[PDB]
Write an enzyme that holds these catalytic residues in place. Sequence first.
Site, PDB file in Angstrom:
ATOM      1  CG  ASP A 163     -24.943   6.188  -1.711  1.00 56.65           C
ATOM      2  OD1 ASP A 163     -25.687   5.833  -2.601  1.00 56.65           O
ATOM      3  OD2 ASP A 163     -23.617   4.840  -2.667  1.00 56.65           O
ATOM      4  CD  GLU A 407     -17.111   9.267   1.640  1.00 55.60           C
ATOM      5  OE1 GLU A 407     -17.701   9.409   1.223  1.00 55.60           O
ATOM      6  OE2 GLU A 407     -15.754   8.623   0.975  1.00 55.60           O
ATOM      7  CE1 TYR A 462     -15.179  10.166  -5.246  1.00 50.77           C
ATOM      8  CE2 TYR A 462     -15.704   8.132  -3.812  1.00 50.77           C
ATOM      9  CZ  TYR A 462     -15.614   9.811  -3.871  1.00 50.77           C
ATOM     10  OH  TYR A 462     -16.228  10.251  -3.170  1.00 50.77           O
ATOM     11  CD  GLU A 498     -15.508   4.756  -1.002  1.00 52.87           C
ATOM     12  OE1 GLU A 498     -15.102   5.758  -1.277  1.00 52.87           O
ATOM     13  OE2 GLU A 498     -17.498   5.379  -0.095  1.00 52.87           O
TER      14      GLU A 498
END
Lengths: 592, 599
Positions: A163, A407, A462, A498
Site C-alpha cells: 500500500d 505482514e 485496524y 500500526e
Amino acid sequence: SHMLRPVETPTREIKKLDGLWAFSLDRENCGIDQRWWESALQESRAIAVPGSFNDQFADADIRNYAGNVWYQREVFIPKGWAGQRIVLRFDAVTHYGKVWVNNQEVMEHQGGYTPFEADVTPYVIAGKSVRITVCVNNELNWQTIPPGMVITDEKKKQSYFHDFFNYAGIHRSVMLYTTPNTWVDDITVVTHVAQDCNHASVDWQVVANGDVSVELRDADQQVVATGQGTSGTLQVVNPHLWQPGEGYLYELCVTAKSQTECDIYPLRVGIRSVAVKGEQFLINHKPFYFTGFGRHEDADLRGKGFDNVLMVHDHALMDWIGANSYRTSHYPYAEEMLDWADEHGIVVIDETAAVGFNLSLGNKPKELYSEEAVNGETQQAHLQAIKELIARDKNHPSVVMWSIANEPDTRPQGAREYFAPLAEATRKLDPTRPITCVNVMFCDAHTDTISDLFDVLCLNRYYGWYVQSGDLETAEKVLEKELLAWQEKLHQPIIITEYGVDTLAGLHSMYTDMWSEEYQCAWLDMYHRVFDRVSAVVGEQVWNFADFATSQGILRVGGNKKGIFTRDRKPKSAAFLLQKRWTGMNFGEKPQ
Amino acid sequence: SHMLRPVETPTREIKKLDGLWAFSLDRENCGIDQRWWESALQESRAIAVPGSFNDQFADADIRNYAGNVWYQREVFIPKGWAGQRIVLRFDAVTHYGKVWVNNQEVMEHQGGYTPFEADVTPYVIAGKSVRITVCVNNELNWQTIPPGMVITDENGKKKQSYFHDFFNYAGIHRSVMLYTTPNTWVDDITVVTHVAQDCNHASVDWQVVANGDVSVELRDADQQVVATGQGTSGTLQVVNPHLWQPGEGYLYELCVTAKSQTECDIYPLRVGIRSVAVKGEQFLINHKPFYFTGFGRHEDADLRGKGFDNVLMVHDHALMDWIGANSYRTSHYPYAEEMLDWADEHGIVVIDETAAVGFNLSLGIGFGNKPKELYSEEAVNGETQQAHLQAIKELIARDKNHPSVVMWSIANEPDTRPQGAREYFAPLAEATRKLDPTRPITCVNVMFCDAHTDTISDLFDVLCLNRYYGWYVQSGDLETAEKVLEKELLAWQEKLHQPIIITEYGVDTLAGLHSMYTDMWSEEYQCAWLDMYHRVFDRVSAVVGEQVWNFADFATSQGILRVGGNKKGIFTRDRKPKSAAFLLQKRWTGMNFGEKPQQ
C-alpha cells in the site's frame, strides 16, 4: 559487504554528485544494445538527483513507466586525488542500478534502499572529466524484495502487493570519496552495560590492510580508553549511557597505519544495551514504552527522494507531538535519519523492504510459498536484504530491533519453513538486538504460525475500519480480546506497530463517522484505553505520520489518508490528541 | 387501489398537516403494547414534517436507529367540511406506517415511497380537534421493497443490513394532508393518448370510476373546450393536436365531472398528448427518435435527508435546465409526485423506477452474513415477488397519467446469473405490461451481468446499462476501459438489438482535488472519464441515451468505499458544480435537442 558511512577525516574526502543529471526513458529497451553509456544520452531532459523520477515532470506517462530509465552526468576528479583510493558510491538506486564510468562497467545492485559502491581508481584520472551513466530499473518479480508481477498487454504494467506507490530512481546521495591505499574497510562495536549501569564495555572488531589502533573519546573529546589490533574490549568507568530522549555519543577513532600511509575513521558509538525480559522491552535494563509512528519516505514532487528540510521539519513535528520512536515502514530509510536518531536519542525499529509476501490484502498464483511465487531464490534474496541492512546499520545505537518483514501471510503451507532460516540467520548476523516480523491482522493469535521464532510481537490492527466499520464499541471488544489472547499465547512484549483510520483533513461530522477528523480522534482514543489495560503492550506507533501516495484505486482518495499530518505537513485534530497523550505521560513509561 | 393526486376544485378542499410534530423513539418497542396513540407522546421532541427523522437532530443514536418511531400532532377539522367525504392522506412514510385518529386505527402501509389514505369521515367531527398518531418503522427484510436483513446483536440491539448504495433514511418524507370530496366523487381516471404517424391527429381514451354519471371536457392551455364525452369510458377526437413534446410539454386539462341526482364532483387531470414506442434500436416519442441526456438522481439533501422541499426542487431543475439535461431516472424509488408534475409542465422525460434495488448479494455497496442463494425460501421468495408486484402496481396506479413518464424500471441491478432470476422476473415483466400497455418497460442491468452472462433482459423493451469500467475495474486506465466498454455495448446491440440507455456512468470525485496526472478521485479524471464514455457512446448506433451517475453527492452507509458518502456527483450535496458540470453543459447544450450526438 563492508559498508562504512563516508565521513570527511584528515585522510578521507567526499565530492557529492547530487544536482541536475541528464535523464531518458527507454520505451524500446534498446539502450543496453545501443550502449547508451558510450555517449551523451540523446533526447534527454534535466532531472534532480536525489529524487524519484516519477513526479518531477507532472507527466502520468513518466509516473506510470515500467522498465529502464537512464541517468547521466559528467564530473571532474579532484587533481589532489592522484595516488589515492577513489570510490564511487550510490546511497540508494530504486530498485536496480548498473553504473558505467566512461565505457567501463563498474557496479550493479538489486535492492532499492541500501548503498552500493566500487573502487573506480583504475578507470578515472585525477584532474579529468569522466562520464557516469546509470541504468535504473523499477521492475518487481517474485525474487525482488519487495515482490511483484509485471504483466505485458501487447506494454508493461507492474502489479505489486503493498500500500505505497512504487516510486523509483536515484532517491539518495551519489558521491565520489577517497581513502589512502591503506584504509579502515569495516568496524563492528558491541556495547555491553552492567545491570547497575555504573560500568560499560565496548568490544571492537576492525578490517583494514594495516596495523589498527583505536581511541574512544567522550563528547568533550577526552580519550577514555585506547586499544590495539583488529579486535578487543575497551573498559568505560561511569559511562554516559546512550538514553532514549538524550542520545549521548562517544567517538571511536579507528587508525589503520602502514609504514608509508595512514587512515583515520571516526565512528559514533552510543553506549546502550537492549533486551526483552518476559513482556518488557528493556533499554539500559529499564522498561521502555514506545510512542510515535509508522512513517514513509514520501513528499510532494520528490517522491521518496531524501531532503534535509523535510528531515528537519518532520523531526520538529515528532518532537512537538511527544513521539519517542518510529519504524522504517516498509524499507530501510536514508542513513541520515539514523544519524539523526543516534544524536537526539530517538528509538528506531529498522525494517527491510520485504512487504508484499501476501496475496490476501486489498492473475495471482495459487500457493504463496511455491516455485511460481515465494521460492528458494526469493528466500536467498530476502537473506541478502537482511545482510545489507545489518551491514549498514549494525553500529547505530538508535536501532533497537530488526523487523525482517511486514505482514506476511503465515497461514499457507511453507510459511514457517521459509521464515525459520531467516530468523536464525538474522540472530547470527547481529546477536545484540531483538528481532521481529510485523504481523498482519487476519494472522490472529489463533491463526499465525511463526511468532514463536521472534522476540517481540509487532501487531498491525485496524478493527473499526476494514471490519466493525464505524462501530467503536464492537471494535474495542474484539481488539482487547485479541491482545489478551496474544499475551496468553506467547508472553512477549507487544508493540502495536500500526493503528489508524483514513481521515480526510477538513471533513467534520457531528455523527463521528468514518473519514471525519472526529472519528480519527474517537478511534485512536479507544485504542489507547485498551492498550493501557493490557500489561503486555510496551508500545504504540500510529499509522501513519503523514498522508502518502499509493497505487490508484477505489480504496485510496488521492492516496493513503491515515496521516496524522497531511502530505504538506498540516496537522489534523488527531495530532493534538496525540500531543496531549504523549507529552502528558512520563517519558518512556506506560500510561495508567 | 385508486390514487388520484389531491387538487383544489370547486368540489374539493385540502388542508396540509405539514409543520412541527411530536416525535419519540421506542427503543424498548412497548408503544403498541402501551397504546401510545391514546395520549400525548410522553418523552417527545419537535420534528419537521416532511423530512427524514435521521439528520434533524445532529445525533448519531437517532441517525442509526432501527425499529419504530412515533409521530403525533393535533388538528382542527374545518367546520364547513360537515357532510363532506373527509380523507386523511400520507404522500409517503418510509418504510412502514400505521395511523390512528384519536383511538381508531385508520390506515396501514408497507412501501416507503407512494401514497396511502383512508376515509376518516366516521372518526372525526367538523369544528373539533383530533389527535393523529403514526407508528413509523424503518426495518427491511427479504419481503420489503427494497430488501435487507436486520441483524440483532447478542444484546438485542438491531442494526439494518442492506444491499443498496444510499443511506436508509426513514420518516414522513412527504406531505400529510386532510382533503374533501363530495359523497359522490371521481375515484379513478386512466387516459391513453394515441397519436397518428403524421402527428396531425390524436385520440384520447378515458376510463373513470365514480359513484355517479360521468361527463368529460378536454380543454387546451387557453381553456377552450376541444372535445366533450359521456360515460365512465370512451374516446375524444383531437384535430391538429398540440402534442406533448420533450423540451416544451404542452398540457391539456381533462375535467371529469361525476353528477349524482343530488351532488357532484369536478376533477381536473393534466393530459399531455404523446405516444412512446420502441422500434428496433430507436426510442420514439411522437414517432421521432429521442436521445436521452441527464442524470440518475436521488432524494437527498443536507439536514432533511429524503424529505421533499420546493426550494431544492426549483434549484435542481434550474441546474438540469442550465446543463442541458432533457431527462432523468427516479433512482432508486418513486420520487415525490411534485417532481412528475414539474416534468409534465416543462417537458422533462422521466424513467419511473420502483424501490426494488438490492436484489444482489455480490456488490460491495450497502451495510452480518449474506444467504448463499439469492432466490430461495430464505431470501427472495414467492412473498418477495408478491411484494414486488404490489410495489409495481402502486407506482403505475400513481403515475399512469404523467406524460413525462416514458418507461417503467421495475428494478435496479438484480443478480441475474442464477436460474431463479428469470423465474422471479418473467411474471413481473408480464404483469407490468398488463398494468400499463402504453409504455415500454426495463430492468436496469448490473455490470457483472454482462451480455454473455445476463438471463432476463430479453423480457424487457429497453436495455438500461449501469457501467463503471475504469473505476471498480481497469481502475484509472481509460485506454483499457474504452476497449472493454465499446466491446460490451456492441455485444449487447448484437444480442438483443434493443435501444441502449447508459443509466449509470460516473466516478467518485472529491470537489477541489486536482491532479496533473488525471488520476482517480480528481476533478480532471471525472472530466477525462466522462469524455471517454461519450466518444464510445457516439460510435455505437444503439445508444439512445446517457444519464450521468449522479446529479449530486449523496449520503450512504459508512464504509471504506465512501468518503463521507457517494462522491460521484456532478454537483456537491450543497449544489456547487465540479469541473465536469461544464464538460456536460458544453456536450448537452451543443448537441441538437433530443438528437444522438456525432463524432
